[PDB]
Structures are given as C-alpha cells and as structure tokens.
C-alpha cells in the first residue's frame, strides 16, 4: 500500500544478455565480462556492451574511413566492435594495426600486404588488457535504407523522410501533395 | 513453426486476441485501397503524399535500352583494371588505358578523387566535372561509339 510509480521494480531498457548461439561470441563475452568486472578500466566495460549489440549496430566500417579516424594517431591500435570491409576506391591502403570481429577477405589481403597487422579481440586482451593507448571506433548507426524512412512522416511540412513506394519515377507519388499545381505543396 | 505463433499461447482466452467489444468482423473499412478518397484520407495525407493526380506527358511504347546508361565514377576507375597500377606509377612514358565499356559502363562522373597517374579513359559519355578532374591528373579523354 505505497504511493509509488509503477511500484518499481523498474526495468532497464537495454539488452541484458547475449542473444547469439554462436559459441565463439559467447566465449568472447565471458572473457570481456571477467575483464570488465575485475580490471576497472572503462574501455572494457564499453567493449562488453558493444559485443552484445545486434547486427545493425555492428555495422561495417570501410578501410578508407578507418584511415582517416586513425590519421594523426598512427601508432595506436584501431579497435572496432564490428566488421571491416575493403574500400575499392582506396588505391593504396594504409598499414595501421586493426582489431575487429571480422575482416572481409579482400581487406585481410589488403592490410597484410601493406605491412599491417590484423588482430582478433582475444589477441587484443593479451597485448592490451586495460585498453591502454587504444582508439575505440564505430560505424555510423543511422546510415541505412531503413533509417531514411524514419522521423516526421513524409507528408508533413519540412520532413525529409522517404515514403514507402513500390516504384520510382513519375506516376508514383509525384502529384497531389508534391506540386502546388495539384492542390497543395507540403 | 506453428509452435512459436501467438495463437498457441492465445488459445484458452475467449477473445482470441481481438477484443470483446469491437470483435474480429469480416471486412470493416472496405477492401484493399478502397476508401482512400474519403474515410482513409488522413492516412493518405502523410505516409503517401502525391498519390492522387497525373503529372507528366505520357510515353507510348517506352523502350528501355534506348535510355539505359550505367555510370561508373572517377573515384573508382582503378578498380576497373592491380598490376597496371604498379606499371603506370613508374616510367613516366605510356599510360594505362581504361576502356570503361569493357567492364560495362557508358558514362563517367567525377564524384571522387583520383591519384595523379597519367591515364586515358575511354567512355561513351563524360560528365563535365569528370573531364576537369581527369585532365588535372594528366589523363586524356577518348570517346567511343
């Protein structure tokens, strides 16, 4: 008999465990939750959380973007809880020393040839338990087909949301609403 | 996986998940896109603006291939032909020729940046910007047809 809001008992919104049945990812988390709990460094606490993320937050960073975040800071190990893709536009790949979950086989060839080390996360623990002189990165989350559609809903004044439309070009959602000559602009 | 669906758990509850007041009636609100003009109008304005009306001049028997034009950018090209790059870095004589048709694009657009290696690009069409960028690289432009 308490005047309490929800008598909370209030839950936490973020994910509380690993969802994968991938056994290697589970053992990765067991490492980095021993290492988070015991070591005290905030690097390991963040890496633990980012390991448990779903696929759309483990988004691929290109080799050419990974150059330019790591530009002034050449010595430091470039961590990315995520995948690493080759940039085809990048002609001469810079050497770096990357850690990540997964390299595509082009990007593994391109770094290793260019004089450039290519680590897993369990190897990063042996070198750098604290995360001393590392660079956390992550690929942009809101940069995909699906996330163009979100926001204020396309027929409202000054939204930049895409409509869900079956096909492109005229004859599809380009008349009443989109022209002033057809009723109204909005 | 019928197992995993809500009906299985939902079984045993009388409403069946649709509610006692309103009920799962056969077709409230019309069928398909019906009612867009009147009752379902609020949904159309927002979500689907520009749906009603006709705009441009119609094209009878429009034929694709007449207009097709796959475009590579200037920032690529090199991906197009890795050995030549180590050849055309050196020498300062001859140049690595990029027939863009052979990989299968017609137009070239200079969205990107290119290394400064003399090169010759042959494409059916060149964007105005692509030409300026290629020339700066010391490259040459050639038209096929």
């Amino acid at each position: 008999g308490i005047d309490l809001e929800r008598n909370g008992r209030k839950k936490k919104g973020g994910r509380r465990t690993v969802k994968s049945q991938n056994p290697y990812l589970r053992l990765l988390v067991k490492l980095y939750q021993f290492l988070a709990r015991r070591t005290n460094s905030r690097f390991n606490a963040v890496v633990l959380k980012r390991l448990m993320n779903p696929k759309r937050l483990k988004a691929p960073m290109s080799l050419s973007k990974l150059a330019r975040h790591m530009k002034g800071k050449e010595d430091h190990i470039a961590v990315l809880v995520g995948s690493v893709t080759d940039d085809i536009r990048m002609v001469h790949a810079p050497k770096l020393t990357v850690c990540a979950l997964r390299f595509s086989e082009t990007a593994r060839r391109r770094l290793e040839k260019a004089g450039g080390e290519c680590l897993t996360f369990d190897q990063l623990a042996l070198r750098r338990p604290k995360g001393s002189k590392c660079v956390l990165l992550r690929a942009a989350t809101k940069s995909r087909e699906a996330d163009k559609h979100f926001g204020a809903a396309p027929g409202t004044p000054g939204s930049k949301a895409r409509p869900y439309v079956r096909s492109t070009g005229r004859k599809f959602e380009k008349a009443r609403g989109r022209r002033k000559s057809r009723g109204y602009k909005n | 996986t019928t197992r995993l669906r809500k009906t299985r758990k939902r079984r045993g509850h009388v409403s069946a998940g649709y509610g006692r007041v309103g009920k799962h009636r056969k077709h409230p609100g019309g069928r398909g896109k019906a009612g867009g003009m009147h009752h379902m109008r609020i949904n159309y304005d927002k979500y689907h603006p520009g749906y009603f009306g006709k705009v441009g001049m119609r094209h009878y028997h429009l034929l694709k291939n007449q207009y097709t034009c796959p475009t590579v950018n200037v920032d690529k090209l090199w991906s197009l032909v890795p050995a030549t790059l180590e050849k055309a870095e050196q020498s300062k004589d001859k140049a690595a020729v990029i027939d863009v048709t052979k990989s299968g694009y017609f137009k070239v657009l200079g969205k990107g940046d290119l290394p400064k290696i003399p090169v010759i690009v042959k494409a059916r069409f060149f964007s105005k910007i692509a030409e300026k960028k290629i020339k700066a690289a010391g490259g040459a432009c050639v038209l096929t047809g």
């Binding site: 559609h149 079956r166 | 398909g32 896109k33 009612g35 867009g36 949904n43 979500y47 689907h48």
Partner: peptide
C-alpha cells in the same frame, strides 16, 4: 489500409 506500409498492389 492502416499504418505506414506500402499501398498494396
């Protein structure tokens, strides 16, 4: 027709 989906076809 409800919500933000594609108009069905």
């Amino acid at each position: 027709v409800s919500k933000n989906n594609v108009l069905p076809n």
